[PDB]
Amino acid sequence: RMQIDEQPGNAIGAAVEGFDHATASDADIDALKSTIYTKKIAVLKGQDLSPQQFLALGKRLGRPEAYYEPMYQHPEVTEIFVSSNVPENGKQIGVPKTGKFWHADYQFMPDPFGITLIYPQVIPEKNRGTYFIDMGRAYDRLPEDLKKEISGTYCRHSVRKYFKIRPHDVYRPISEIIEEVERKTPAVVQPTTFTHPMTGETVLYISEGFTVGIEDQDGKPLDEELLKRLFDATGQLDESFEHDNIHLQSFEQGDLLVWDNRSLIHRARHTTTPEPTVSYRVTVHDERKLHDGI
Ligand SMILES: C[C@H](CC(=O)O)NC(=O)C(=O)O
Ligand SMILES: [Fe+2]
């Protein structure tokens, strides 16, 4: 039935053939999750699923959690995060072109989930994909001066930079929305590096989209150049996307991307044209927290 073909050596990614979430065994799920923690990306091939079946597939990997802002939610399945620029019956479903920035999912939240699932529905014919950076691999290749400078430091993550304007936000003062974002989703504090509870790797838990500051042990803020140097060194400032840390993951019809939300930061690659693009997303919590300090 299920057959996992991992990429050779330390290459990122792994293809999964003949996977049926309804008939997959417990050993198939454990082996798949083990591939996600080690190969970071698991591409399920030939997935023809309804929105209800996509949620049932995500339930096999963990406990799904719906996005906190309801305008992203699928009308039928509230646990499905919808990124869509294609109206259905003239109504806007989801939010158009999400995640066009380096980030980890729910990084700005106090308890991020460990597994992210992406099921593209409408795929533009050419320049479409998703960039990826292994922050565990990025920390290992950091310069020694940066490793010891961030030792014992903390980082603050906030969605204040890419919080999308909601339909009911029209005609409201922009400072009224800013204070609402800082009230409902205040900046969370995480250690700059944590230990992956599944693999034991040291993960540099930062992202240009969500990480807004860096502090030492006492919470005393450090110069924001330290964060900018970390973004530059890991490849999050390369607008050409030719950095060695950057991996471009494309997909065909029927692919279902399941990747490690602890180690990986990602960025949506969209066309420079108004070409239709629809993607469904399910995000689940596994048997452990983001790290053993949460
Ligand atoms: C703000 C952003 C959605 C968007 O780009 O509109 N949130 C996430 O990506 C997530 O953490 O799930
Ligand atoms: Fe995302």
From Swiss-Prot:
Residue numbers binding 2-oxoglutarate: H270
Full protein name: (3R)-3-[(carboxymethyl)amino]fatty acid oxygenase/decarboxylase
Gene encoding the protein: ScoE
Residues reported to bind (3R)-3-[(carboxymethyl)amino]butanoate: Y67, Y72, G99, Y106, K164, R281
Keyword terms, alphabetized: Dioxygenase, Iron, Metal-binding, Oxidoreductase
E.C. number(s) listed in UniProt: 1.14.11.78
Positions with a binding annotation for (3R)-3-{[carboxy(hydroxy)methyl]amino}butanoate: Y67, Y72, G99, Y106, K164, R281
Record lineage: Bacteria, Bacillati, Actinomycetota, Actinomycetes, Kitasatosporales
Family classification: Belongs to the TfdA dioxygenase family.
List of residues binding Fe(2+): H103, D105, H266
Domain of life assignment: Bacteria
Recorded catalytic activity of this chain's protein: a (3R)-3-[(carboxymethyl)amino]fatty acid + 2 2-oxoglutarate + 2 O2 = a (3R)-3-isocyanyl-fatty acid + 2 succinate + 3 CO2 + 2 H2O; a (3R)-3-[(carboxymethyl)amino]fatty acid + 2-oxoglutarate + O2 = a (3R)-3-{[carboxy(hydroxy)methyl]amino}fatty acid + succinate + CO2; a (3R)-3-{[carboxy(hydroxy)methyl]amino}fatty acid + 2-oxoglutarate + O2 = a (3R)-3-isocyanyl-fatty acid + succinate + 2 CO2 + 2 H2O; (3R)-3-[(carboxymethyl)amino]butanoate + 2 2-oxoglutarate + 2 O2 = (3R)-3-isocyanylbutanoate + 2 succinate + 3 CO2 + 2 H2O
